[PDB]
């Protein structure tokens, strides 16, 4: 991320984020195992504005 | 052949609405007695023999005969008189 946008600048930020289900890659507590013919996961995603 | 999730498991069929029975089921479509209509014919005028045929052709004869044989005039030799 840019430290400053000055008058007229235009900044590009990147960011990641990881969204954890099971608790590390050692340790498979609260993964899910999403084999399901009928129903469908959801991950809600709401953004800056 | 599938594997069972025991995370999420599921149950067996619900009920749903349906296509009104009846619509399902058909009629047995009731089949009244026909005929071979007219009278036919014996025979017909057929367009090619019905019969074989040769692929090639042979030269047949018939006998003649000659006539009444005639005697000759023949030229006659001459004597041997140790001359021959």
Redesign the interface.
């Known amino acids: 991320a840019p430290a400053t946008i000055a008058a007229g600048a235009t900044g590009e930020l990147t960011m990641y984020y990881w969204v954890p289900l099971a608790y590390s890659e050692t340790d498979l507590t609260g993964a ?5 013919p ?2 469908k996961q959801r991950l809600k995603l709401e953004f800056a504005n | 052949m599938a ?1 069972i ?4 498991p ?1 149950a067996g069929p619900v009920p749903i609405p349906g296509p009104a029975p009846t619509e399902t089921m058909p009629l047995l479509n009731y089949r009244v007695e026909g005929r071979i209509a007219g009278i036919q014919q014996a025979r017909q005028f057929m367009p090619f023999l019905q019969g074989p045929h040769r692929e090639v052709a042979e030269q047949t004869y018939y006998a003649i005969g000659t006539g009444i044989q005639m005697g000759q005039t023949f030229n006659q030799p001459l004597i041997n008189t140790q001359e021959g």
């Not at chain 1, 899910?32 to 399901?36: I, R, S, T």
């Open positions: 899910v195992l999403a084999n399901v009928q129903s | 594997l999730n025991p995370q999420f599921y």
